[PDB]
Amino acid sequence: MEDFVRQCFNPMIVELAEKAMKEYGEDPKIETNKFAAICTHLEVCFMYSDGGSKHRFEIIEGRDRIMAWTVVNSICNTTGVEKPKFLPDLYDYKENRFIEIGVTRREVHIYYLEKANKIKSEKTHIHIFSFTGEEMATKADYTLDEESRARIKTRLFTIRQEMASRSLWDSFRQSE
Numbered sequence: 001m002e003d004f005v006r007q008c009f010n011p012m013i014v015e016l017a018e019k020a021m022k023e024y025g026e027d028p029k030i031e032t033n034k035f036a037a038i039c040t041h042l043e044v045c046f047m048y049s050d051g052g053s054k055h056r057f058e059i060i061e062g063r064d065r066i067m068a069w070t071v072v073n074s075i076c077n078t079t080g081v082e083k084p085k086f087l088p089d090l091y092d093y094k095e096n097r098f099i100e101i102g103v104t105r106r107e108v109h110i111y112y113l114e115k116a117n118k119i120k121s122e123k124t125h126i127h128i129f130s131f132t133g134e135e136m137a138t139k140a141d142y143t144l145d146e147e148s149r150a151r152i153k154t155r156l157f158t159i160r161q162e163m164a165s166r167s168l169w170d171s172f173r174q175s176e
């Protein structure tokens, strides 16, 4: 999984995932499935953009969580949007709402429901992606155009297929 993660993901993404796990008392080399899951979730957050023109999305994920909260505060003060109780993944400057991104090896609908229960607030948008080319979003609002989401689904499916050829997929699917 390590050898796969180092080869499959960008070195900056690998460095961020190593920090997040060591920060939470877990080592990248034993809980290898968490290593790959954190790398994949980070990548999806980076691709969550229409890829053109303005900086529509503030990426909250992948940053020092203490510092990321000050950014959420600054947005809420300027925008007036209610403050989320849990640190979201992105903020949409066009729709003026926070986004929680989910990447699951389980089903998109059951993973959305768990997120919605935990989020509690109806204001934070939820967008779930799977490794099987499916997605689920709040009120069927997928935020991005279909080509941007197609890039994410194909990348996730590509990750899924690359793991499967190395016999790593089934264990990665069961770790969740």
Ligand SMILES: O=C(O)c1nc([C@@H]2CCCN2C(=O)COc2ccccc2)[nH]c(=O)c1O
Pocket (backbone or CB within 6 Å): 020, 021, 024, 026, 034, 038, 041, 061, 087, 088, 089, 101, 102, 103
């Ligand atoms: O998408 C998601 O599932 C998602 N989940 C979380 C959960 C909530 C509790 C803390 N936590 C984390 O994973 C915090 O990092 C960790 C935790 C354990 C090991 C390594 C890193 N946080 C999100 O920001 C997020 O996007």
Ligand SMILES: [Mn+2]
Pocket (backbone or CB within 6 Å): 061, 087, 088, 089
């Ligand atoms: Mn997050």
Ligand SMILES: [Mn+2]
Pocket (backbone or CB within 6 Å): 041, 089, 100, 101, 102, 103
């Ligand atoms: Mn997330």
